[PDB]
């Protein structure tokens, strides 16, 4: 029997930062202080204009999201009028920030999450990580050659950076609404080092005494994605239009609007610690590959369907497990693992299985990643 997926409106984005829809402002061969870098990145864009709301947050105070972005711009203009750029910027505690910083309906699967996953498996033009017995050695280098440019690896480094920055600011600046650039770094195909700005978050108060204590934040992320194409994906966001980008195409130059995706969010101490640990995804998926290799001859696997895609696909699954971590995901994977073994055991053809299905399917509510894996599971069943 196939798994029963819930009915309801399309599921919506719930990651801590944009994935496929992200947009970088970058500077090449920059130099180390986040705020400094962020400003220089901002200055590379000249299409800025008066911001306006173009897709409202249905459940939020929309003017507050717009005032917040205007405030970020204003305080950035201030710290450029200062003699020396400060090491960090604590935002004025305005009414819009105080509100923004806070001071289960079933959903159907929509195609955007499979699309996200597909994007995560792809190669990018940039290298996102450098290579840090001898049989175990050759494997680490070949594997790394295959995933260092992978988009999922960008997500890892992006996630490590923002969780490190947020966790540190949470400890060092507990009562400040600190402004925190979202940054990553990479190397181009020609070897040039590049610094990337995705946007900003602003932290709320953060006396994180326990691992489960939550710090609130508001995230502000650049994008060229028009949210009106997939409104359901963006139910948690206010989207602003903030500039115009002149884009060079083989058809000519095209003007496209730049958007800012804004939402309020929160994360706990322990999720941030896991966030800092996302490079484990590289190791964890390398081990799965070695398990396949040690079932037979290392040079043969990586020199001779294709090994590159298998690496990147395992990495993306691992990365997406981290990005979309949840009790439901843990419930689904632990339980569906049991059904799989039982079904696979029928290569030979607590009582019944009615109980097992209930355990699996009650994990299937509204989480897009869990729902997608369910859809994958059904394909495995229906074959």
Which DSSP letter does residue 94 get?
Answer: -
Q: What share of the chain is helix, strand, coil (3-state, %, to 5)?
A: 45, 20, 35
Using alpha carbons, select from 131, 272, 294, 268 the residue that is nearest to residue 213. Answer: 268
- Report if residue 9 sits inside a domain: no
Query: What are 199's strand-pairing partners?
Result: 182, 221
User: Phi and psi at residue 91, in whole multiples of 5°?
Assistant: -75, 145
- Report if residue 2 sits inside a domain: no
Which run of H or E residues covers position 300? helix 298-303
Query: What are 223's strand-pairing partners?
Result: 259
Report helix angle 135-147 to 280-293, nearest 10. Answer: 120
To what resolution in angstroms was this structure determined?
A: 2.2
Among 245, 275, 305, the domain boundary falls at 275
Q: Where would I find the beta strands (DSSP E) of the chain? A: 25-28, 48-55, 89-90, 178-187, 193-203, 214-223, 238-249, 252-268
Which residues have a Cβ under 8 Å from the Cβ of 105 and sit 6 or more positions away? 8, 9, 366
Residues 171 and 191 in one domain: yes
Among 234, 258, 275, the domain boundary falls at 275
- Report if residue 4 sits inside a domain: no
- Report if residue 1 sits inside a domain: no
Residues 205 and 56 in one domain: yes
- Report if residue 27 sits inside a domain: yes
State the pairing for strand pair 193-203/25-28: antiparallel
User: Contact, 198 vs 55, CB < 8 A?
Assistant: no
Exposed/middle/buried for 79, CB within 10 Å: 0-12, 13-18, 19+? Answer: middle
Distances (CA, A) of 217 to 159, 205, 318, 360: 15, 9, 26, 33
Residues 156 and 168 in one domain: no
Give the total number of structural domains in the chain: 2
Which DSSP letter does residue 236 get?
Answer: T
Residues 184 and 264 in one domain: yes
Residues 39 and 132 in one domain: no
Exposed/middle/buried for 167, CB within 10 Å: 0-12, 13-18, 19+? Answer: buried
Output the CA torsion 74→78→79→80 (10° steps): 100
Query: In degrees, to the nearest 5, what angle opens at C-alpha 296 toward C-alphas 293 and 298?
Result: 45
Residues 21 and 129 in one domain: no
Which residues have a Cβ under 8 Å from the Cβ of 377 and sit 6 or more positions away? 3, 336, 340
Using alpha carbons, select from 17, 289, 329, 313 the residue that is nearest to residue 157. Answer: 17
Query: In degrees, to the nearest 5, what angle opens at C-alpha 321 toward C-alphas 372 and 130?
Result: 130
Question: In terms of residue numbers, what domain contains 190?
Answer: 16-102+161-275
Residues 177 and 309 in one domain: no
Which residues have a Cβ under 8 Å from the Cβ of 242 and sit 6 or more positions away? 48, 49, 51, 69, 222, 258, 259, 260
State the pairing for strand pair 214-223/252-268: antiparallel
Neighbours of 356 (CB within 10 A): 15
How many CA atoms are closer than 13 Å to the CA of 381, on its beta-carbon side?
Answer: 15
């Amino acid at each position: 029997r196939p798994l029963r997926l819930p009915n309801g409106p399309p599921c919506s984005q719930r990651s801590k930062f944009l994935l496929m829809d992200a947009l970088k402002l970058s500077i090449e061969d920059p130099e180390g202080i986040p705020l400094y870098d962020a400003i220089k990145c901002m200055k590379t864009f000249f299409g800025w204009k008066e911001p306006n709301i173009i897709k409202p947050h249905e459940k939020g105070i929309n003017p507050n999201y717009l005032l917040t972005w205007k405030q970020v711009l204003a305080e950035l203009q201030d710290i450029e009028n200062e003699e020396k750029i400060p090491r960090t910027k604590n935002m004025k505690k305005t009414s819009q920030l105080k509100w923004a910083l806070g001071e289960p309906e079933p959903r159907s699967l929509a195609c955007w999450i499979q699309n996200e996953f597909n994007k995560a498996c792809e190669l990018t033009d940039s290298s996102w990580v450098e290579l840090d017995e001898h049989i175990a050695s050759m494997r680490r280098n070949y594997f790394t050659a295959e995933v260092s440019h992978c988009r999922a690896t960008e997500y890892i480094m992006k996630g490590v950076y923002i969780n490190t920055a947020l966790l540190n600011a949470s400890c060092a600046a507990m009562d400040d609404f600190q402004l925190i650039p979202m940054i990553s770094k990479c190397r181009t195909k020609e070897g040039r080092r590049k610094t990337n700005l995705y946007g900003f978050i602003i932290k709320g108060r953060s006396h994180l005494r326990n691992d489960t204590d939550v710090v609130n934040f508001v995230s502000m992320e650049f994008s060229l994605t028009d949210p009106r194409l997939e409104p359901h994906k963006w139910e948690k966001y206010c989207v602003l239009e903030i500039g115009d980008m002149l884009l060079r195409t083989a058809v000519g130059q095209v003007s496209r609007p730049m958007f800012l995706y804004v939402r309020t969010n929160g994360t706990s101490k322990i999720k941030m610690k896991w966030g800092m640990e996302m490079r484990r995804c590289l190791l964890q998926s390398l081990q799965q590959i070695e398990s396949m290799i040690e079932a037979e001859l290392t040079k043969e696997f990586f020199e001779n369907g294709s090994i590159g895609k298998v690496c990147r696909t395992l990495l993306a699954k691992s990365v997406f497990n981290s990005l979309y971590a949840s009790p439901q995901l843990e419930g689904f994977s632990a339980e569906s693992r049991k059904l799989l073994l039982i079904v696979q055991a029928l290569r030979d053809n607590t009582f019944d299985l009615e109980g097992l299905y209930e355990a699996i399917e009650e994990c299937l509510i509204n989480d897009p990643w869990v729902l997608l894996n369910a859809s994958w599971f059904n394909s495995f069943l229906t074959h």
